[PDB]
Amino acid sequence: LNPLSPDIWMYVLLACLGVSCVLFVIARFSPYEWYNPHPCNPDSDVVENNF
C-alpha cells in the first residue's frame, strides 16, 4: 500500500462508491436503458432495466 498515499486510497474507495451510486441513478433517469430482455418473441410490456 506504500506507492499511493493514504489520502489516495480513501479517495479511490470514496469515488468507487460515488460513481457506483451516480451510474445507478443516471441509468434509471435515462430512457434508453429501458428495453426488453426477451428479443425472441415480440413485446408484451416486458420493458426491463438491468442496473
Binding site: 434509471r28 433517469f29 430512457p31 429501458w34 432495466n49
Partner: peptide, 14 residues
Amino acid sequence: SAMVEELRMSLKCQ
C-alpha cells in the same frame, strides 16, 4: 408526456 414517463422510471419498486 414527459410527466407521464418520469413516474414510470421513478417507479421505486422495479
